[PDB]
Amino acid sequence: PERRVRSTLKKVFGFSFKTPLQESATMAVVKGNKDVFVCMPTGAGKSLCYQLPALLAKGITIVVSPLIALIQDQVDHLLTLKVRVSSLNSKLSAQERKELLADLEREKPQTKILYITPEMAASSSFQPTLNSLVSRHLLSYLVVDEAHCVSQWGHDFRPDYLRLGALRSRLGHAPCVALTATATPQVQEDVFAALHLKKPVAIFKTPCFRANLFYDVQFKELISDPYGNLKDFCLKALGQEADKGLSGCGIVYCRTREACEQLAIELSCRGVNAKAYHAGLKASERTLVQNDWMEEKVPVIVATISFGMGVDKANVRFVAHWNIAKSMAGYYQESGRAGRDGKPSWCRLYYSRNDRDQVSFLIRKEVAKLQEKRGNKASDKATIMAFDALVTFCEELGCRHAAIAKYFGDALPACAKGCDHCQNPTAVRRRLEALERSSSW
Amino acid sequence: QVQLVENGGGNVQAGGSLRLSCAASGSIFSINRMTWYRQAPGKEREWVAAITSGGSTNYADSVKGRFTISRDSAKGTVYLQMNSLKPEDTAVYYCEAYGTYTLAPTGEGEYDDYWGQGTQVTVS
Ligand SMILES: [Zn+2]
């Protein structure tokens, strides 16, 4: 029952689950009645969802993955837990290889979990093994990690993955589990179709929505004192405990370096200490400023794309975007650095049609430079498509969280006075209608 | 689970009209293809008309321009307007919810095809 999962969880891996979803996903794999899809975040609970069932399975669990780094790092950890896990890769000595292939062909093999590349899984040099495994009914699950690699609307398309559809079909008896971290509903629809996944596909997608975060859009065209507006915003978000004075830290994002330097200074002078972060600075300078912000010598940082959340923070109570980001995902990713501690936080986008256009041009320029180097890809469509969705995020009226959830493919979220539009629908209508007056400035 | 239920069926005279709706219960996010099928007793199921996610509509050549299907996106309900009926059109009418992506905010959801109960429709 549930009983089995608890014991195998503690006895081996030494744990309860990180998410009640992670639990219910794993459980549904284990019952093995249905193919299953998992789109969780970079939180490696995805791994556990297929691994734990595999050990309960009284049969062999194949596990496709696209490159070796990914495999090795996991199979090592699986070994550390005293688990009969095996890799079959083209970076393997002839003798190692032939020893495993032999293992698989045995009545009652050593191997419980086989990590294969799509290359090996395709190669005729493995097919008979495959068939004989099937024939002895010794295959208990087929797993497809980084499933997004099957979709051209994905960020990491690998033709090899396309072959996997046929494979699933061949391995009829066995359920299939697909997993990824980042899947637009287009990707997920590609997955279900490309990997010929049997209905009913059971789905375990972690929603992108987060209660404690408050999204809003402002229009730089409808603001007399921009710098002042930012001060007020930073101030309201910080100093949530006024007897202490200033509590928490926050981020300001720019496209350009001059913007960053200039904006740090303007904020600092208005009484809100901020330091700049851009690739323009020397490496030493950057690593110092990061510490200052991390130790809360400086409550605010003003940064370009080069942040990369190398070391992210719990008490980030505001992320303000001075220019629109390249993608809805890029804004979600960036803004998502806010409120990791679960305490109320503020995410603000400062939209401009002037900005929209300059970035649209820069996207077009850096796409044309790849088309002449390479050619016409369905990914070039996606680059612009990804950006159009975020222009639409700004320019349309509606729950800011539900606009996000549409793009990522989540249920309509429980906002609860959790964004500008949900809080005051009339002031948003005003601000939009206002952008039409000031359309010609 | 998911429920697909039809209504709007009944008895009419030749050259009459009816409007049919199949109501989709459950945490629906999308339905790849909602399809209208009719079952004359003692004969083969007939494909009638169908609407894709994003409102693209196609109809059988036997019911072209007489029948017309629509989605009240807000309602989450699809309608088959049947005007200029004939005794041929006398059948049971039901829907196929092909590629029915359901999902709650817990992350827990499914993807399956559902078939409706179906409403009796007689044309004198
Ligand atoms: Zn909202």
What chain B holds in terms of domains, given with CATH numbers, is: 3-123 (2.60.40.10)
Q: What phi and psi, each to the nearest 5 degrees, are found at residue A132?
A: -60, -40
Residue-level length of chain B: 124
What is d(CA A29, CA A52) in angstroms, rounded to the nearest whole number?
9
Can you list the alpha helix ranges (DSSP code H) found in B41-112? none
Of B101, B104, B110, the CB nearest to A202: B110
- Asked if A414's CB is within 8 angstroms of B110's CB, the reply is no
And the tokens for B24?
Answer: 């989709």
State the sign of the Cα–Cα–Cα–Cα dihedral A111, A117, A118, A123.
negative
Residues of chain B positioned with their CB less than 8 A from the CB of A179: none
- Asked if B29's CB is within 8 angstroms of A411's CB, the reply is yes
Domain A2-205, CATH number (from 3.40.50.2300, 3.10.20.880, 3.40.50.300, 3.30.70.20): 3.40.50.300
- Residue positions forming the annotated binding site of A for ATP: 15-16, 18, 22, 41, 43-47
What is d(CA A20, CA A16) in angstroms, rounded to the nearest whole number?
9
Best mutation target among B30, B33, B103 (most A Cβ atoms within 10 Å) is B103
And the tokens for B28?
Answer: 């629906």
- Residue positions forming the annotated binding site of A: 15-16, 18, 22, 41, 43-47, 399, 415, 419, 422
Instruction: Map out the domains of chain A as residue ranges.
Output: 2-205, 213-438
Resolution in Å, one decimal place: 3.6
- Classify burial at A311, counting beta carbons within 10 Å of its beta carbon; exposed 0-12, middle 13-18, buried 19 or more: exposed
- Tell me which amino acid residue A386 is: A
Topology (CATH level 3) of domain A213-438: Rossmann fold (3.40.50)
Best mutation target among B106, B110, B112, B114 (most A Cβ atoms within 10 Å) is B106
Q: Which of A216, A210, A206, A213 is nearest to A182 (CA)?
A: A206
And the tokens for B9?
Answer: 């069926």
What is d(CA A140, CA B52) in angstroms, rounded to the nearest whole number?
36
Q: By the CB < 8 Å criterion, does B52 face chain A?
A: no
Cα-Cα end-to-end distance for chain B: 38
- Asked if B111's CB is within 8 angstroms of A203's CB, the reply is yes
Q: DSSP class of residue A11?
A: I
Q: Distance from CA of residue A440 to its chain's centroid?
A: 38
Distance B72 CA to ligand 1 centre (A): 23
Distance A424 CA to ligand 1 centre (A): 10
Q: A2-205 with A213-438: one CATH topology?
A: yes
